[PDB]
Design an enzyme around this catalytic site. Structure first.
Site, mmCIF file in Angstrom:
data_model
loop_
_atom_site.group_PDB
_atom_site.id
_atom_site.type_symbol
_atom_site.label_atom_id
_atom_site.label_comp_id
_atom_site.label_asym_id
_atom_site.label_seq_id
_atom_site.Cartn_x
_atom_site.Cartn_y
_atom_site.Cartn_z
ATOM 1 N N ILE A 39 35.009 43.137 41.353
ATOM 2 C CA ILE A 39 33.874 42.771 42.193
ATOM 3 C C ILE A 39 32.981 41.844 41.363
ATOM 4 C CG2 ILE A 39 31.887 43.611 43.495
ATOM 5 C CD1 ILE A 39 33.513 46.254 43.831
ATOM 6 N N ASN B 278 47.234 36.766 38.375
ATOM 7 C CA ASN B 278 46.446 36.400 39.549
ATOM 8 C C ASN B 278 45.087 37.094 39.502
ATOM 9 O OD1 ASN B 278 48.258 34.630 40.801
ATOM 10 N ND2 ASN B 278 49.394 36.355 41.704
ATOM 11 N N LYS C 1 31.713 45.575 32.549
ATOM 12 C CA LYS C 1 31.558 46.782 33.333
ATOM 13 C C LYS C 1 31.841 48.008 32.483
ATOM 14 C CE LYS C 1 32.286 44.244 37.382
ATOM 15 N NZ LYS C 1 32.193 44.356 38.829
ATOM 16 N N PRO D 41 36.960 47.605 38.110
ATOM 17 C CA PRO D 41 38.038 46.607 38.181
ATOM 18 C C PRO D 41 39.383 47.249 38.008
ATOM 19 C CG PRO D 41 36.267 45.781 36.817
ATOM 20 C CD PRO D 41 35.919 47.214 37.140
HETATM 21 CL CL LIG Z 1 29.170 38.674 39.570
HETATM 22 CL CL LIG Z 2 35.036 46.087 40.155
#
Ligand SMILES: [Cl-]
Ligand SMILES: [Cl-]
Ligand SMILES: COc1ccc([C@H]2CC(=O)c3c(O)cc(O[C@H]4O[C@@H](CO)[C@@H](O)[C@@H](O)[C@H]4O[C@H]4O[C@@H](C)[C@H](O)[C@@H](O)[C@H]4O)cc3O2)cc1O
Ligand SMILES: [Cl-]
Ligand SMILES: [Cl-]
Ligand SMILES: [Cl-]
Ligand SMILES: [Cl-]
Ligand SMILES: [Cl-]
Ligand SMILES: [Cl-]
Ligand SMILES: [Cl-]
Ligand SMILES: [Cl-]
Ligand SMILES: [Cl-]
Ligand SMILES: [Cl-]
Ligand SMILES: [Cl-]
Lengths: 114, 114, 114
Positions: free
Chosen positions: A64, A97, A32, A1
């Protein structure tokens, strides 16, 4: 991310360790590994929020998955809390955002995550 | 809503009142109170458009609604007009990306707008 | 199209000709005329990737079409290669977000591409 914060607060007011705090707090919040969290802080910006140039921030979080109605409320409380405590920015002067990225649309290491 | 302009025009060429003019003109154009409008101008950037480093701009407008075919054409005429008049950037050297944000994906004030 | 690279590499380490190489290589890669390719490089940023401030880059490519699974893998190989050769950034410390823009959401020259 990826988390980006653009702010008019001066660089000297960004505490040492802020990038690492964002990294670790977002690794925990998104689930993550921290090795995949990228953070970018841009101080000293020429910005206004509601016409006023008091401290403010414009931010984005790209991930993601791990993006959605309840998750984004949780991220907003976490991130507004950090910006208030560390940068002294009022939460009503922050926009964040959120972007749920498709794996095929995130490039890394000569390829994509697809 | 949030409007960002990145440009290679130098900081000293950005007139006093530019952020304020953007705030009120975007308030009028989106029909939203000026208190909702955030604006961010980034001068002195290393940028090219068509291979040329004549004055240019890369911009974005994010809004919860108020984004669409005719509306975006009107925003582009307004914003290109301002960049031409105030920063002396030719309209054919400006890109503006428009983003219609879902309310659940816009964080503000420890929550989101969902 | 528009390509943006944000990096913590210092400005003096960005070689002469870098914006031109990006412009020309992206024209070739996307099949689009070079007159419409915009490029923006932002050095000296406060950034971390995986918690470390070793050289890294966060990038984006916005294009009306010519975005997709295989195409984005090809762009990532091209763009990471350029960042490694010219800025000495390891490809595993680069993210590139890809955006397939609708023509109606790209402003230019007082209008949009719709
Ligand atoms: Cl997910
Ligand atoms: Cl990601
Ligand atoms: C199409 O759908 C939507 C489209 C757009 C929006 C947005 C856009 C956004 O930018 C926005 C905003 O910035 C502020 C805002 O504020 C008010 O929302 C009411 C209720 O709406 C009240 O609860 C007030 O408290 C009131 O909240 C505040 O007024 C603020 C200006 C102050 O800073 C804050 O301290 C408090 O005084 C409401 C907003 O709405 C929401 C949607 O659902
Ligand atoms: Cl730091
Ligand atoms: Cl921490
Ligand atoms: Cl959720
Ligand atoms: Cl996506
Ligand atoms: Cl954009
Ligand atoms: Cl809005
Ligand atoms: Cl959205
Ligand atoms: Cl395009
Ligand atoms: Cl991005
Ligand atoms: Cl493809
Ligand atoms: Cl789009």
């Amino acid at each position: 991310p990826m988390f980006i914060v653009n702010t008019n607060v001066p660089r000297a007011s960004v505490p040492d360790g802020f990038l690492s705090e964002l990294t670790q707090q977002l690794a925990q919040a998104t689930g993550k590994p921290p090795q995949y969290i990228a953070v970018h802080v841009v101080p000293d910006q020429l910005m206004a929020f509601g016409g006023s140039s008091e401290p403010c921030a414009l931010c984005s979080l790209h991930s993601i998955g791990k993006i959605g109605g309840a998750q984004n409320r949780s991220y907003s409380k976490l991130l507004c809390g950090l910006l208030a405590e560390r940068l002294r920015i009022s939460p009503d002067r922050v926009y964040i955002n959120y972007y749920d990225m498709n794996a095929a649309n995130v490039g890394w290491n000569n390829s994509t995550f697809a």
